[PDB]
Design an enzyme around this catalytic site. Structure first.
Site, PDB file in Angstrom:
ATOM      1  N   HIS A   1       0.812  -1.210   0.000  1.00 55.92           N
ATOM      2  CA  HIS A   1       0.000   0.000   0.000  1.00 55.92           C
ATOM      3  C   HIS A   1       0.849   1.265   0.000  1.00 55.92           C
ATOM      4  O   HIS A   1       0.305   2.358  -0.199  1.00 55.92           O
ATOM      5  CB  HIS A   1      -1.067  -0.035   1.108  1.00 55.92           C
ATOM      6  CG  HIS A   1      -0.576   0.356   2.471  1.00 55.92           C
ATOM      7  ND1 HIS A   1      -0.200  -0.561   3.429  1.00 55.92           N
ATOM      8  CD2 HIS A   1      -0.450   1.574   3.055  1.00 55.92           C
ATOM      9  CE1 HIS A   1       0.167   0.076   4.529  1.00 55.92           C
ATOM     10  NE2 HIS A   1       0.017   1.373   4.332  1.00 55.92           N
TER      11      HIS A   1
ATOM     12  N   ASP B   1       0.093  -7.636   1.654  1.00 58.67           N
ATOM     13  CA  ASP B   1       0.519  -6.237   1.667  1.00 58.67           C
ATOM     14  C   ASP B   1       2.031  -6.165   1.861  1.00 58.67           C
ATOM     15  O   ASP B   1       2.549  -5.840   2.936  1.00 58.67           O
ATOM     16  CB  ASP B   1      -0.230  -5.481   2.755  1.00 58.67           C
ATOM     17  CG  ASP B   1       0.013  -3.992   2.713  1.00 58.67           C
ATOM     18  OD1 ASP B   1       0.532  -3.505   1.690  1.00 58.67           O
ATOM     19  OD2 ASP B   1      -0.331  -3.304   3.702  1.00 58.67           O
TER      20      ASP B   1
ATOM     21  N   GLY C   1       1.644   7.010   8.678  1.00 58.29           N
ATOM     22  CA  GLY C   1       3.028   7.347   8.449  1.00 58.29           C
ATOM     23  C   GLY C   1       4.009   6.283   8.886  1.00 58.29           C
ATOM     24  O   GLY C   1       5.174   6.336   8.487  1.00 58.29           O
TER      25      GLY C   1
ATOM     26  N   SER D   1       3.259   3.144   8.148  1.00 57.27           N
ATOM     27  CA  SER D   1       2.999   2.192   7.077  1.00 57.27           C
ATOM     28  C   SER D   1       4.291   1.710   6.452  1.00 57.27           C
ATOM     29  O   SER D   1       5.159   2.513   6.102  1.00 57.27           O
ATOM     30  CB  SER D   1       2.198   2.888   5.969  1.00 57.27           C
ATOM     31  OG  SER D   1       0.835   2.994   6.292  1.00 57.27           O
ATOM     32  N   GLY D   2       4.383   0.399   6.235  1.00 58.31           N
ATOM     33  CA  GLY D   2       5.520  -0.170   5.547  1.00 58.31           C
ATOM     34  C   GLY D   2       6.708  -0.464   6.440  1.00 58.31           C
ATOM     35  O   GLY D   2       7.633  -1.160   6.006  1.00 58.31           O
TER      36      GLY D   2
HETATM   37  N1  6SO Z   1      -1.557   0.422  13.280  1.00 61.16           N
HETATM   38  C1  6SO Z   1      -1.472   1.490  12.279  1.00 61.16           C
HETATM   39  C2  6SO Z   1      -2.173   1.055  11.000  1.00 61.16           C
HETATM   40  C3  6SO Z   1      -2.148   2.083   9.913  1.00 61.16           C
HETATM   41  C4  6SO Z   1      -1.375   2.091   8.788  1.00 61.16           C
HETATM   42  N2  6SO Z   1      -1.652   3.194   8.028  1.00 61.16           N
HETATM   43  C5  6SO Z   1      -2.633   3.926   8.641  1.00 61.16           C
HETATM   44  C6  6SO Z   1      -3.245   5.113   8.248  1.00 61.16           C
HETATM   45  C7  6SO Z   1      -4.215   5.634   9.066  1.00 61.16           C
HETATM   46  C8  6SO Z   1      -4.562   4.977  10.247  1.00 61.16           C
HETATM   47 CL1  6SO Z   1      -5.809   5.689  11.235  1.00 61.16          CL
HETATM   48  C9  6SO Z   1      -3.976   3.805  10.653  1.00 61.16           C
HETATM   49  C10 6SO Z   1      -2.980   3.256   9.833  1.00 61.16           C
END
Ligand code: 6SO
Ligand code: CA
Length: 223
Positions: free
Chosen positions: A40, A84, A175, A177-178
């Site tokens: 993602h 993912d 933020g 993410s990844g």
């Molecule tokens: N445990 C964090 C999971 C997660 C990854 N990207 C996100 C973007 C927005 C929100 Cl609210 C949560 C996330």
């Protein structure tokens, strides 16, 4: 990272920042030329930033290397987030040292109860928005598959696990993410998704890296 702590500069030497004019995702250095992140996080024009602590200040240990190619998992589904995971190849090999170092891939899957380290530059508020400049860390356990599925009915596949705290207050966030989930010196997870961040009964969901080791190794061997 919500409810974590300041890691300390370069104490997480496999943590990378993916930059497209700004930090947009984490990732994990797995050898001198390759980074693992979340599918993602895919976009074109990625610069990989290694050796970072404060992502807004040049502090002296950074290596900025443009990506030459990204490979999203062949079965990634962006609606369900199944599979993912994505690989990013660097245009040139990183110079590996004590502050820029690869993280080992797992040889076996981790069990519920294993303690892990989750890290990133994501939001530090469960309600509201505040982005740190320095890397944040959180120690968190892997949760049982049954509690994960109960938290997110109909959404947890065999390629996902939950980690964190059902009470809330401690989680990865936007933020992050990844980025990495490292347990006993092995990369076991990738920050993938959840319902908000640090919410009660809604732990973070992570890509189960151990299911992908064969794909990672074969992809690297031919790219
Ligand atoms: N445990 C964090 C999971 C997660 C990854 N990207 C996100 C973007 C927005 C929100 Cl609210 C949560 C996330
Ligand atoms: Ca910096």
């Amino acid at each position: 990272i919500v409810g974590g702590y300041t890691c300390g500069a370069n104490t997480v030497p496999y943590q990378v920042s993916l930059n497209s004019g700004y930090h947009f995702c984490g990732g994990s250095l797995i050898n001198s030329q390759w980074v693992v992140s979340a599918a993602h996080c895919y976009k074109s024009g990625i610069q990989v930033r290694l050796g970072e602590d404060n992502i807004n200040v040049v502090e002296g240990n950074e290596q900025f290397i443009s990506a030459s190619k990204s490979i999203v998992h062949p079965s990634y589904n962006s609606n369900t987030l199944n599979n993912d995971i994505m690989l990013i190849k660097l245009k040139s090999a990183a110079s590996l040292n004590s502050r820029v170092a690869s993280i080992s891939l797992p040889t076996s899957c981790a069990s519920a109860g294993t303690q892990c380290l989750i890290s990133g530059w994501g939001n530090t508020k469960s309600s509201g928005t505040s982005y740190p400049d320095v890397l944040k860390c959180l120690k968190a356990p892997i949760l049982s598959d049954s509690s994960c599925k109960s938290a997110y009915p109909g959404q947890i596949t065999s390629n996902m696990f939950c980690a964190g705290y059902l009470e809330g207050g401690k989680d990865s966030c936007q933020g992050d993410s990844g980025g990495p989930v490292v347990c006993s010196g092995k990369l076991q997870g990738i920050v993938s998704w959840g319902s908000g961040c640090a919410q009660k009964n809604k732990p973070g969901v992570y890509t189960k890296v151990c299911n992908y080791v064969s794909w990672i190794k074969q992809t690297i061997a031919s790219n």
